[PDB]
Design a binder for this molecule. Structure first.
Ligand SMILES: [Ca+2]
Ligand SMILES: [Ca+2]
Ligand SMILES: [Ca+2]
Ligand SMILES: [Ca+2]
Ligand SMILES: [Ca+2]
Ligand SMILES: [Ca+2]
Lengths: 215, 215
């Protein structure tokens, strides 16, 4: 059987509500007066009453904004009965897809990450890994993260002792002169940004990396 | 049988093209590899190639802007055959509705209308009827017309001897002093405006009414 095409609806709709979607009817209406209903999560199951259908026309509507991070897809069924109570069609599958909007900023697992690097390490020495997560769709830009260092303290012998791999979160030395007797700890502020790290449209968050110089 | 919901598309789309509409597939794809096509006016019949479908996905698309005043609705059918040439579904009806935009200004049947009114007629005397038509949807604002008088020449004994019923196009005297020996002919410019006569968003046109005073 051919499947009723899915309805694709972006989350966080402004409305106004209720909002008409599509019209579901039976061709048996040619000789019979029909009554339409819908069942399933979003309809007669939790969360109740988000989608509704006009008993007479079969016009399907949505009554509230949706949130993809709560429910990504709704499986409903449409029902047809005539005015004498006769069931005239087998109930038919309907699919509503909720389309992602970038409505979550990246989140770091820990607010403070700790790591260490030996005294006198050569440039290009691996130090530690920091990472974030994004609650939006991973397969979209809305959930794709990039990393950068915003500040380093203290600023000696070089104000940029480290860099960070912008996709992996790996922190690595790019400079020499790490001496425990001179400077014992560095504090870096790490930023994560979604939308592939786009500075204009991405959402960002920050975290702290503390790096101790060892013997 | 439940009918595939109609696709409602406004005319004069900006695109860009090709533009994805909906996805039509068969649930027999669970065990079979399927090939999809579409037939009908707009597809394989004049006008050819306006709607197309991806053989593999079943994604339906439109390739050009539409014009409601040429074709208001398209009746297509979707077809499913497997890779061994087996027809796996009966072809299914698809309906595309073209939604009206206000893209036609009112048109007068004649550019010059002629009528007459007897000398010394009392105020409220019926004179003639002028009308226009609109090629847009009559049941929408885009094709609903209102009428008004823009100018009268000459401007004596009163610069407004006539009025016009704004919905009927009936022209009627509102003033006395029609005297053939004094002024023999009036020339009125009549405007028609759609969108229920809305001066901001309506489209307009004009015509000329020549009214002779008789004995
Ligand atoms: Ca959300
Ligand atoms: Ca989201
Ligand atoms: Ca995000
Ligand atoms: Ca048109
Ligand atoms: Ca039109
Ligand atoms: Ca019009």
């Amino acid at each position: 059987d051919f499947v009723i095409p899915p309805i694709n609806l972006p989350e966080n709709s402004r409305g106004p509500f209720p909002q008409e979607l599509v019209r579901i009817r039976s061709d048996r209406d040619k000789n019979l007066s029909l009554r339409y209903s819908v069942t399933g999560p979003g309809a007669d199951q939790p969360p109740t009453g988000i989608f509704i259908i006009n008993p007479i026309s079969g016009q399907l509507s949505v009554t509230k904004p949706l949130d993809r991070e709560l429910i990504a897809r709704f499986h409903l069924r449409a029902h047809a009965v005539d005015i004498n109570g006769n069931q005239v069609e087998n109930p038919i599958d309907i699919v509503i897809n909720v389309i992602d909007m970038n409505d979550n900023r990246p989140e770091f697992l820990h607010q403070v990450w700790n790591g260490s690097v030996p005294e006198g390490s050569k440039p290009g020495t691996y130090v530690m890994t920091v990472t974030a997560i994004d609650a939006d769709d991973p397969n979209a830009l809305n959930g794709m993260l990039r990393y950068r260092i915003l500040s380093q303290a203290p600023s000696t012998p070089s104000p940029n002792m480290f860099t960070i791999n912008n996709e992996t979160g790996d922190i690595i030395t790019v400079a020499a002169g790490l001496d425990r007797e001179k400077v014992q700890q560095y504090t870096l502020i790490i930023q994560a940004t979604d939308m592939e790290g786009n500075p204009t449209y991405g959402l960002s968050n920050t975290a702290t990396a503390v790096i101790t110089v060892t013997d």
